[PDB]
From a paper:
In mammalian heart mitochondria, the majority of CI is found in association with CIII2 and CIV (SC I+[name]+IV; respirasome) or in association with CIII2 alone (SC I+[name]). Here, we report the isolation of functional SC I+[name] from ovine heart mitochondria.
Because of the hinge-like motions between the different regions of the SC, we carried out focused refinements on distinct sub-regions to generate higher quality density maps. These focused refinements were performed on the peripheral arm of CI, on the membrane arm of CI and on CIII2, resulting in reconstructions at 3.8–3.9 Å resolution and improved atomic models for each region of the SC. The structures here allowed us to improve the completeness and accuracy of the ovine CI model and to obtain an atomic model of ovine CIII2, with clear density for endogenous CoQ bound to three of the four possible sites. Accordingly, although no exogenous CoQ was added to our cryoEM sample, clear density for the CoQ-10 head group can be seen in the CIII2 focused maps at three of the four CoQ binding sites. Density could be seen at both QN sites, which are expected to have a higher affinity for the oxidized CoQ-10 and the QP site distal from the CI Q-tunnel. However, the QP site proximal to the CI Q-tunnel did not display any density for CoQ-10, suggesting different affinities for CoQ-10 in the QP sites of the different MT-CYB protomers. Each Q cavity contains a CoQH2-oxidizing QP site and a CoQ-reducing QN site; however, the QP and QN sites within each cavity derive from the opposite CIII protomer and, hence, the QP and QN sites of one MT-CYB subunit face opposite cavities. One of the Q cavities is proximal to the Q-tunnel of CI, while the other is distal on the opposite side of the dimer and much less accessible.
Residue numbers in the entry:
A (entry chain a3): 2 to 445
B (entry chain f2): 2 to 49
C (entry chain i2): 3 to 59
D (entry chain d1): 11 to 110
E (entry chain a2): 148 to 227, 234 to 293
F (entry chain a4): 148 to 227, 235 to 439
G (entry chain b1): 2 to 379
H (entry chain b2): 2 to 109
Write the structure that this text describes.
């Protein structure tokens, strides 16, 4: 018992700032394992027309030596201290984290500084990375889910640079040189926008003093012109369909207007997508699930899988539903999906809202389990929200959401909006877009 | 598949939308009101 | 352009509100249009109808 | 009690022991009874469709069985009632879960 | 292939010749599971052009005369791999059909020689198909 | 079963376990192809009867108290095979043009200095790579085969450890006509490490990698739950991870060279799948 | 492969008349579907010939009908086929309904509701046709039933001066009823097709009520010759009725011309509408009478909502069987009381017969059903 | 799931009126099916009203039609609607046959 008292004993995020505007963020708990990483607001959104495919490329070149330790001594020393080094980069953020032992912290932070601010560029390395990234482009072509999400951003954010893919196109990657990456690193990995985040078995004065020794002297002297500042990108709303009838299954994604980050409409939509949410064809107890879409999809064998979900970008995003279904049940699956959205928006009962609140509490606590996803949450939270919002505040915002506000917010965002529909595969039986928009609202 | 961008329909768009820097939220209400205004007046005439 | 925003927000968000709107519009438009077409058909002759000469008789 | 005498006379004069049918061969089939019929062992299910096909044959010819093969009330092997009770209990439990 | 392998004997003998050679005798009589549909006429032209030659052909006639066959094959043909090693091994199949089949097989002899004739004598010493129908096989 | 065996790795590990043992460990986690639809529920009832008794049950609770769990276990839970080694192979012509080959000898049971020596040996020879999209400048087998063959491939060590026996070997993902060179080069490298040519800082880096792997398998409560339950079910006492690290760094490279000699000199076993026109059988290795 | 199983017409004919799976058990009571169909097309054809020889006006309607029955060749047999075919049409319609109510075939919902709509349509059509000959009984029947439509407050009097075609039964009333009698059986044929469509969706019944999914036999050529046999029996009954005693069922009081001044003493329907007229004049209240009539046929709508038994047929329930035969004798009693004058014993037993009709249907069927549900341990 | 794909009448209505796979390049000559159908229901309806106000007798048939045109409320609009709808009906019919002959639909 004492769940409120159990949430009061959740450890607190120590946030501090180095004189280059650096954001250091330590999470001190009582484990013998630590995780130290850099989170940067530098993605495939700030790029120009010909800077496309820069964050991916610099991520693939950040682990191939430097001007301090040549070639592969970085890899040799990280495995000499037994750490797991990983990186990722999306359309909005870019991170480099290290999973290591607690007493092997300061050399790990020194190697992390040598990752960020000294990434030199070698020409055999740039040939090697050009070859490897062309191989990875051609192999990610054959996957389907990434193709659907790339199509969805391309048809949803026409013209605006949010529809730039993270990989970039083939011809803005197969001709890059040292000049583009040099201006990329001089402009984007600046000091007042990067966050050192470290969670696990480490103190705060220790991490702060190591950052004062090593990170102080990085940058902050931004150059004269073209300071990166966002533009409110235009959600067009359209459909793209890649008819390709030599495939077993069909992939459809459909998304509507963006909630954002700071507004509590994000919390209401996470309650709604905790109500509908997910299903895979390999679950147990098929005929009896709580989600009515899952009930119908097992009762009549409509779809293989779905997840009805959220994605939030800087001041925008997509309120979405991705379903993977066979090429003879697309119309019925689409119909029941819009039926569930409008059952939320018209006649929402209390019991389903209570179920959604409980499922979202357990989803949040399960995602904040283990030091590496929690440090991930701290990095993305000190970039997006400006503070890691504690779980007592999450519990307050959840419990102060009831059924009436849910149907208000969902009728604000679902009801009679223009969709973005991405389709891939054997999707000729997908309804035409005017029948989709006519199915968005039901007159009865 | 990475080189799949739209050929944009900037010739076809309504003038409330046409900027690629402004938002697309506040220019939605009047647009839906205009189209549904046309449907409402047609329905009035047919019912008459 | 602001004048259609509240029109969509008050008479086109629902469906029953839209139906009540076109019914009230149909009655009001029926009255106004019958009066207007009667005025047009009186104006287009002004000297030929039974009405004005019969109240002169 | 004499009400058992009423039940025995009624099972005699009801007309479904004449055609070789037992108690649960004449049940009307909604969704619940269709489920309880699908929940059966194989031997009882084959004996059931055989007795049903003999009943439809004997009513096609409108001839009723000799004296030595009428189903008797003393050996009334009613069998479909437990599965049908389980279907009704699970259906009412699902209904109550929807109501609250 | 389905009609062929409704007999257990064919599948046992094909796993037998797959488990006793690392090489060209371990090729099946039948097309396998995955190659159905992925064999193209390019490989058909190739296999026909380099395995149908005018030295690998025996034209045999029963009831016809030799000069007619000589005319046919003299006028209308005019066209113009690796040894198998022993491997040793076992292949088991869990099929649950309540009849265990088992072949225990060792390398004996090439064809043509009295060594192979002696192995033929040895199999008729050991035991062959039933000469007497519904019998007892008291000679085997 | 279809969704689980859409990977190749599941096929190769299950053919590995089906080929190495003539005995109870040859069975698979998944149902076979022909038993679908042909299993009664009485077999399930008899299985639950003669295996779900209170002599075999560990009950772990994270976040909950002890005596509530004790009273529940009192009020509800009052309810009460020497795997032989076979040798040989399973070869499966599949045709994806990526040869998967698992080469495995028998090693040792769980809970021994010999078993910890085999864990140190798999950290010497290389695991799932640390620096992502890296070049693996420390794993010995990858260095040997990248010295040999200039292709895309992967070599990984393989240490399965059970309560009766164990399987040590490695695991190669290669091209079509390049498989034999990779397998032979890796086998030569394991032989020259079994010769005794293994220095001191490599074994110290292997001790640090094994310490890191064990202490990073207990970050989340999922893996910690599994660790506490499996170790309490093994003997009956949870030994803390610090003295587990003590038993890890207690051993030395004499046990490592003895373990590698016991790998090489033993009778090999393998499981291979794909386009197998060049995979050497046993004798060519 | 075959002509029949690919052609778009012959798939319809195949799923109707050839390879429709019908049960191997249905008795002679399942012939009246085809008998109503053959009677309906016979009404359409013979009425079409009568409409070729008819002049619908209140001056010359009776003169034109007399011209048919005297001067045109065989107009007398075609007119007698039309009238007695209406009589046999309602005989087979009430036997069809009695089958569908007794053997538990009212567990079908949509077929039953489209059935009741067909009953409304055939009754209105046959009344308009009975107005058409323009005799004394037709004149006063039109007058009294149009004032029955005027009984309802706030809707009635305007509606009845609207369908009067004036202020009484004028020329326009005769022409309106000619047009609606001359169009409504085509709508009856279309709704009969819809009726038959929902049947071929669900599947037929049998005298046991057990579902007969094991023993379906094809429709052709067993039930086709069975329906030919039923059709020959129906045509011989219809033709003996029109050739020996054509006046045995018809009204004597029709054959006077329409004098709007006389009002004969023995006013009555043609015999099929006696019980509708017997529920009416056995309740001393205007709105109560017309509402009780409409509630009678809406009780036939209600009947699927009271199947609280657990067998399907009434073959195996003897208590409900005896109560159904009480219901049949009570409806025949209502028909007899409607076909009489109005005096003191007739008043009393007309009131008692209507009360016992509603008591048998709305109360006695579920009480017999719950004694059935109790008595066999369910 | 959907009433439009399970109800036995609505299967026919759905397969003829909504979920019908139609080609995408129809010009205005493919209207005349609907025009002939709506002319047909209009001619049937106006004709049924005419048949309610008509008396076929050769002494008073023409007088009955004159009575329709003069004395009955809007009966002149219904009479002229029936006659001119017949002429527009045959206009739409010959446009329909011209489409069916010209665009080669007579391979059906
Ligand atoms: C004048 C009416 C004449 C009726 C003559 C009926 C003769 C047959 C009577 C009879 O035998 O009834 C018992 C029988 C039992 O059913 P079954 O299983 O077929 O028989 C096997 C063993 N007897 O049942 C039958 O054979 C048929 C049972 C009756 C089915 C027809 C019903 C008669 C018509 C009812 C008309 C009224 C219905 C409601 C109308 C409401 C209108 C507002
Ligand atoms: C008639 C007025 C003239 C219509 C006209 O000029 O139509 C031009 C149009 C051209 O057709 P085409 O060039 O093939 O299509 C261009 C599309 N990119 O041509 C058309 O659209 C032709 C389609 C209509 C053809 C028939 C129009 C007249 C209807 C009566 C035809 C009678 C046929 C015989 C019937 C009795 C025998
Ligand atoms: C317009 C007059 C009617 C015609 C022409 C007609 C025609 C038919 C036909 C052809 C059938 C299929 C054959 C059969 O089962 O007997 C049928 C079945 C049926 N009809 Fe009607 N019907 C009419 C009126 C009614 C009425 C008024 C009802 C009662 C509401 C009704 C209820 C039924 C039922 C329940 C069945 C199914 C019977 C069974 O499957 O055993 N019908 N009808
Ligand atoms: C569309 C088909 C029909 C046509 C064309 C038609 C035509 C006619 C005509 C012209 C008359 C006047 C002749 C006469 O009164 O004897 C008439 C009368 C009559 N019709 Fe119809 N009718 C049709 C359908 C029906 C139906 C379906 C019924 C009911 C079963 C019916 C029942 C009657 C009755 C009872 C009369 C009065 C007969 C009499 O008293 O002599 N008609 N019909
Ligand atoms: C079944 C439905 C119909 C009925 C009941 C009907 C009835 C009548 C009647 C009573 C008249 C004579 C009234 C008059 O001419 O002033 C008439 C005239 C006529 N009808 Fe129809 N009609 C029907 C359908 C049609 C159709 C489908 C057509 C062809 C498009 C058609 C074409 C005509 C024409 C050309 C006339 C002559 C009009 C004139 O010259 O005054 N009718 N119809």
């Amino acid at each position: 018992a004492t769940y409120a008292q159990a949430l009061q004993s959740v450890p607190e995020t120590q946030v501090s700032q180095l004189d280059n505007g650096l954001r250091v963020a330590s999470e001190q708990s009582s484990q013998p394992t630590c995780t130290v990483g850099v989170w940067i607001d530098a993605g495939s959104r700030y790029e120009t027309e010909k800077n496309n495919g820069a964050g991916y490329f610099v991520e693939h070149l950040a682990f191939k030596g430097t001007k301090n330790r040549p070639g592969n001594a970085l890899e040799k020393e990280v495995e000499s201290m037994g750490a797991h080094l990983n990186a990722y980069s999306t359309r909005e953020h870019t991170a480099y984290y290290i999973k290591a032992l607690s007493k092997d912290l300061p050399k790990a932070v020194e190697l992390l500084a040598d990752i960020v601010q000294n990434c030199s560029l070698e020409d055999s390395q740039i040939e090697k990375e050009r070859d490897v990234i062309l191989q990875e482009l051609q192999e990610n072509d054959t996957s389907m889910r990434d193709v659907v999400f790339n199509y969805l951003h391309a048809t949803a954010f026409q013209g605006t640079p949010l529809a730039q893919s993270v990989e970039g196109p083939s011809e803005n990657v197969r001709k890059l040189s040292r000049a583009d990456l040099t201006e990329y690193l001089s402009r984007h990995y600046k000091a007042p926008r990067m966050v050192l985040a470290a969670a696990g078995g480490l103190e705060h004065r220790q991490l702060l003093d190591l950052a004062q020794k090593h990170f102080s002297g990085l940058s902050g002297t931004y150059d004269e012109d073209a300071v990166p500042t966002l533009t409110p990108c235009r959600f067009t709303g359209s459909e793209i369909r890649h008819r390709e009838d030599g495939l077993p299954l069909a992939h459809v994604a459909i998304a509507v207007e963006g909630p954002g980050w700071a507004n509590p409409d994000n919390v209401a939509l996470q309650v709604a997508n905790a109500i509908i949410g997910h299903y895979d064809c390999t679950y147990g107890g098929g005929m009896h699930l709580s989600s009515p879409l899952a009930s119908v999809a097992v009762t009549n064998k409509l779809c293989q899988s779905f997840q009805t979900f959220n994605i939030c970008y800087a001041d925008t995003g997509l309120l979405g539903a991705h379903f993977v279904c066979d090429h003879m049940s697309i119309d019925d699956m689409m119909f029941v999906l819009q039926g569930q959205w409008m059952r939320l928006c018209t006649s929402a009962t209390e019991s389903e809202v209570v179920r959604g609140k409980n499922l979202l509490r357990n989803a949040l606590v399960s995602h904040l389990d283990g030091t590496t996803p929690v440090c991930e949450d701290i990095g993305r939270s000190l970039l997006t929200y400006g503070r890691r919002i504690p779980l007592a505040e999450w519990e307050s915002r959840i419990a102060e959401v009831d059924a009436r506000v849910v149907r208000e917010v969902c009728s604000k965002y679902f009801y009679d909006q223009c969709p973005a529909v991405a389709g891939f595969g054997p999707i000729e039986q997908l309804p035409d877009y005017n029948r989709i928009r006519s199915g968005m609202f039901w007159l009865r | 598949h990475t080189d799949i961008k739209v050929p944009d329909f900037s010739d076809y768009r309504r003038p409330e939308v046409l900027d690629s820097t402004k938002s697309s939220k506040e220019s939605s209400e009047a647009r839906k009101g205009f189209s549904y205004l046309i449907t409402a007046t047609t329905t009035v005439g047919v019912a008459y | 352009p602001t004048l259609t925003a509240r029109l969509y927000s008050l008479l086109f968000r629902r469906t029953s509100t839209f139906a009540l709107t076109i019914v009230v519009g149909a009655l009001f438009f029926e009255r106004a249009f019958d009066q207007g077409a009667d005025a047009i058909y009186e104006h287009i002759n002004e000297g030929k109808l039974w009405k004005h000469i019969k109240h002169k008789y | 009690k004499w009400l058992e005498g009423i039940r025995k006379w009624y099972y005699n004069a009801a007309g479904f022991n004449k055609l070789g049918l037992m108690r649960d061969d004449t049940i009307h089939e909604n969704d619940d009874v269709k489920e309880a019929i699908r929940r059966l062992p194989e031997n009882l299910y084959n004996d059931r469709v055989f007795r049903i096909k003999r009943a439809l044959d004997l009513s096609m010819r409108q001839q009723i069985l000799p004296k030595e093969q009428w189903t008797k009330y003393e050996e009334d092997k009613f069998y479909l009632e437990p599965y049908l009770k389980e279907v009704i209990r699970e259906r009412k439990e699902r209904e109550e879960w929807t109501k609250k | 292939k389905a009609v062929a392998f409704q007999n257990p004997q064919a599948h046992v003998i094909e796993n037998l010749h797959a488990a006793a050679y690392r090489n060209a005798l371990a090729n099946s009589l039948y097309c396998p599971d995955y190659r159905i549909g992925k064999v193209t006429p390019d490989e058909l032209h190739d296999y026909v052009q380099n395995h149908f030659t005018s030295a690998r052909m025996a034209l045999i006639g029963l009831g016809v005369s030799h000069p007619v066959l000589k005319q046919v094959a003299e006028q209308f043909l005019n066209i113009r791999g690796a040894k198998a090693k022993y491997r040793g091994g076992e292949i088991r199949e869990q099929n649950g059909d309540s009849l265990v089949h088992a072949a225990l097989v060792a390398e004996s002899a090439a064809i043509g020689s009295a060594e192979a004739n002696a192995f033929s004598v040895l199999q008729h010493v050991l035991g062959a198909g039933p000469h007497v129908k519904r019998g007892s096989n008291a000679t085997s | 079963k279809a969704v689980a065996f859409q990977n190749p790795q599941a096929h190769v590990i299950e053919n590995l376990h089906a080929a190495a043992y003539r005995n109870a460990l040859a069975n698979s986690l998944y149902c076979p192809d022909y038993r679908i639809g042909k299993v009664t529920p009485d077999e399930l009832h008899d299985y639950v009867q003669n295996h779900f008794t209170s002599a075999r049950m560990a009950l772990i609770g994270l976040g909950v108290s002890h005596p509530v769990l004790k009273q529940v276990a009192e009020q509800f839970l009052n309810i009460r095979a020497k795997a032989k080694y076979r040798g040989g192979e399973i070869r499966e012509q599949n045709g994806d043009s990526l040869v998967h080959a698992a080469l495995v000898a028998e090693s040792a049971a769980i809970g021994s200095a010999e078993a910890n020596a085999f864990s140190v040996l798999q950290h010497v020879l290389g695991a799932g790579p640390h620096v992502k999209r890296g070049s693996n400048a420390t794993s010995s087998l990858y260095q040997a085969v990248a010295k040999g063959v200039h292709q895309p491939f992967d070599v990984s060590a393989f240490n399965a450890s059970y309560s009766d026996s164990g399987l040590f070997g490695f695991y190669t993902i290669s091209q079509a006509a390049s498989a034999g060179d990779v397998i032979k080069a890796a086998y030569n490298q394991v032989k020259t490490i079994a010769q005794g040519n293994l220095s001191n800082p490599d074994v110290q880096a292997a001790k640090n990698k094994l310490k890191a792997g064990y202490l990073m398998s207990v970050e989340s409560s999922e893996g910690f739950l599994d660790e506490v339950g499996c170790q309490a079910l093994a003997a009956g006492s949870y030994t803390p991870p610090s003295t587990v690290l003590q038993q890890i760094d207690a051993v030395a490279d004499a046990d490592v060279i003895n373990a590698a000699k016991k790998f090489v000199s033993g009778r090999k076993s393998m499981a291979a799948s794909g386009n197998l026109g060049h995979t050497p059988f046993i004798d060519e290795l | 492969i075959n002509i029949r199983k690919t052609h778009p017409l012959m798939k319809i004919v195949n799923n109707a008349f050839i390879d429709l799976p019908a049960p191997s058990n249905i008795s002679s009571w399942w012939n009246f579907g085809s008998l109503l169909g053959i009677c309906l097309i016979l009404q359409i054809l013979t009425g079409l010939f009568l409409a070729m020889h008819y002049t619908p006006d209140t001056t010359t309607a009776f003169s034109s009908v007399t011209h048919i029955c005297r001067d045109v060749n065989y107009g007398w047999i075609i007119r007698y086929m039309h009238a007695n075919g209406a009589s046999m049409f309602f005989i087979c319609l009430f036997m069809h309904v009695g089958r569908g109510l007794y053997y538990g075939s009212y567990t079908f919902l949509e077929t039953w509701n489209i059935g009741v709509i067909l009953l409304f349509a055939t009754m209105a059509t046959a009344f308009m046709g009975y107005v058409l000959p323009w005799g004394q009984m037709s004149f006063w029947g039109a007058t009294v039933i149009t004032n029955l439509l005027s009984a309802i407050p706030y809707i009635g009097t305007n509606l009845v001066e609207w369908i009067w075609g004036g202020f009484s039964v004028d020329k326009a009333t005769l022409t309106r009823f000619f047009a609606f009698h001359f169009i409504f059986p085509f709508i009856i044929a279309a709704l009969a097709m819809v009726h038959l469509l929902f049947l071929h969706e669900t599947g037929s019944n049998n005298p046991t009520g057990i579902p007969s999914d094991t023993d379906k036999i094809p429709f052709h050529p067993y039930y086709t010759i069975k329906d030919i046999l039923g059709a020959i029996l129906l045509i011989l009954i219809l033709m003996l009725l029109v050739l020996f005693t054509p006046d045995l069922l018809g009204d004597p009081d029709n054959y006077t011309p329409a004098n709007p001044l006389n009002t004969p003493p023995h006013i009555k329907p043609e015999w099929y509408f006696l019980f509708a007229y017997a529920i009416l004049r056995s309740i001393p209240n205007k709105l109560g009478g017309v509402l009780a009539l409409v509630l009678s046929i809406l009780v036939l709508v209600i009947m699927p909502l009271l199947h609280t038994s657990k067998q399907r047929s009434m073959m195996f329930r003897p208590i409900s069987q005896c109560m159904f035969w009480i219901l049949v004798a009570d409806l025949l009693t209502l028909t007899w009381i409607g076909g009489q004058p109005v005096e003191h014993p007739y008043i009393i037993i007309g009131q008692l017969a209507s009360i016992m009709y509603f008591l048998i249907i709305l109360v006695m069927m579920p009480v017999a059903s719950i004694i059935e549900n109790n008595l066999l341990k369910w």
